[PDB]
Design a protein around this ligand. Structure first.
Ligand SMILES: C[S@@+](CC[C@H](N)C(=O)[O-])C[C@H]1O[C@@H](n2cnc3c(N)ncnc32)[C@H](O)[C@@H]1O
Ligand SMILES: C[S@@+](CC[C@H](N)C(=O)[O-])C[C@H]1O[C@@H](n2cnc3c(N)ncnc32)[C@H](O)[C@@H]1O
Ligand SMILES: COc1cc2c(cc1C1=CCN(C)CCC1)N=C(N)C21CCC1
Ligand SMILES: COc1cc2c(cc1C1=CCN(C)CCC1)N=C(N)C21CCC1
Ligand SMILES: [Zn+2]
Ligand SMILES: [Zn+2]
Ligand SMILES: [Zn+2]
Ligand SMILES: [Zn+2]
Ligand SMILES: [Zn+2]
Ligand SMILES: [Zn+2]
Ligand SMILES: [Zn+2]
Ligand SMILES: [Zn+2]
Lengths: 259, 260
């Protein structure tokens, strides 16, 4: 049963419907869907355009001489992102200071969602997000979008369920509780199929990466998307509830934690 | 003797290309600036971008009704005839806090440039911008885009030719000298066919209106676009050059200066 034809109300490149064939819960409305991060705290991001590293290409930035391409860290594009073996990977997309055209090949994340997703009711994990088409390894899925808040503010938010940390070693957080995009509905999987990548577009302030999800393997039609929320989340939450990802390899179920 | 010397000065950043032609002289397509399609800053502007305090509507349609709390556009994206073209009020477009669909009728400026424009070499005023199509009165043309700076920083800029004052009353300016869009090339006309309007979209920091040009009459294909730069400019620049607008009632010509 279709409870909403587009939770994004046209804010994304494509519609993101919500269905619930499992239970009585209506299409969630306790948040505001936004497609880009909102700044509701006090931080000053360095947006100084003269600070940007930029390329001088006048092709499609598909050559290895593209300076922006060369700045990528712990990852790189083949045709699709690959990651280095074993600190998160950094992508520097082209920006307003680059000489290239708006439609160069180094603007994947800033160009937005391309894959077909659906918000759906899962059996045991509330709302989740699934792929409606096959998605090859290394494909951009969606950004993790919300309010940029400080570490102090995140620690006192009443609900911690929608936080994503921007951590160097001084930390900032993206809180998708009140304002967020489709990513706020992605569950934890102990068997993850997407990974977060730190991306820079309009600014290159290393304290404030944008978080982009890329597939970590080929994903089949119908599969739930999920990332590894990590030990910080589970060390907190496992004292109240345990993982219901249902994987034969689950690391956070009551059974796995007892053993 | 006009051939395209650049097919798109905006490098595909706008919805339509903006070609550059020169049938007057030997000047090359301007390259002493960086074309950008949204405002930038160098030193920090403390824009208040906090979403929780935005005024916003509760429409769940396309904001074509009378009850949209966000007021000035008609069904076609044009300023309503009531709209005071002499003393423009502020426009608050829809934002991320609004309930409506992205594609609603109150996001005209955020949708960007729709009309065909051309950067061209003028006879007597350097580079200028002209319409390559008819533009009905009250149509959005383009935004004045550049580097946001304080009025105090503007007062010390070496070149003041590309400044635009952001009306609030501390005040700010856009400087399009180093970073700007097609608007940086629009000349002064004493018989202007476009007007600037302060607009708020994603934030409502009243210090930092964004400046949108709307046609003030029906404009014909080929007509040079221009707004009235105003007295702050001519009080300064009259002593360096006179107006070449060619208007019959030109208020800033060698002739008019002489009388005054
Ligand atoms: C960011 S929300 C994901 C969307 C959430 N399922 C919903 O319905 O709104 C994170 C919360 O979802 C639930 N959740 C996510 N992954 C889970 C898992 N593997 N096992 C149990 N609950 C999970 C927990 O309540 C967790 O705090
Ligand atoms: C914002 S720039 C407009 C683009 C400019 N024509 C160019 O070639 O780069 C403003 C400058 O253009 C020239 N200009 C603009 N309008 C003019 C006019 N009506 N008469 C004479 N010069 C004008 C003056 O040099 C003025 O400072
Ligand atoms: C209990 O979960 C969290 C607690 C904190 C967090 C991030 C999470 C995460 C929440 C879920 N999110 C979707 C991804 C995992 C990180 N950042 C934080 N600062 C805290 C520690 C108390 C608030
Ligand atoms: C000489 O022209 C200007 C001087 C100043 C200005 C705006 C203009 C304008 C320049 C041209 N622009 C495209 C439209 C008219 C305003 N804002 C300013 N603060 C000053 C006063 C000295 C710097
Ligand atoms: Zn490049
Ligand atoms: Zn680049
Ligand atoms: Zn590029
Ligand atoms: Zn699990
Ligand atoms: Zn409305
Ligand atoms: Zn609105
Ligand atoms: Zn609206
Ligand atoms: Zn004149």
């Amino acid at each position: 049963k279709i409870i909403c034809r587009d939770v994004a109300r046209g804010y994304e490149n494509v519609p993101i419907p919500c269905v619930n064939g499992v239970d009585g819960e209506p299409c969630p409305e306790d948040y505001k869907y936004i497609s880009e991060n909102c700044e509701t705290s006090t931080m000053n991001i360095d947006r100084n355009i003269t600070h940007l590293q930029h390329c001088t290409c006048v092709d499609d930035c598909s050559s290895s001489n593209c300076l922006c391409g060369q700045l990528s860290i712990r990852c790189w594009y083949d045709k699709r992102l690959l990651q280095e073996f074993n600190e998160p990977p950094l992508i520097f997309e082209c920006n307003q200071a680059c000489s290239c055209w708006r439609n160069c090949k180094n603007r994947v994340v800033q160009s937005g969602i391309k894959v077909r997703l659906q918000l759906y009711r899962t059996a045991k994990m509330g709302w989740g997000v699934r792929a409606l088409q096959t998605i090859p390894q290394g494909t951009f899925i969606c950004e993790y979008v919300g309010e940029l808040i400080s570490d102090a503010e995140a620690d006192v938010r009443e609900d911690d369920s929608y936080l994503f940390d921007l951590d160097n070693k001084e930390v900032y957080c993206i809180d998708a509780r009140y304002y967020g995009n489709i990513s706020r509905f992605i569950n934890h999987l102990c068997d993850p199929n997407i990974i977060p990548v730190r991306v820079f577009m309009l600014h290159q302030d290393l304290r404030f990466p944008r978080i982009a999800f890329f597939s970590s393997r080929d994903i089949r039609t119908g599969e739930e998307l999920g990332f590894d929320y990590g030990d910080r989340f589970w060390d907190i939450k496992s004292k109240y509830f345990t993982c219901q990802c249902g994987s034969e390899k689950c690391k956070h179920s009551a059974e796995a934690i007892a053993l």
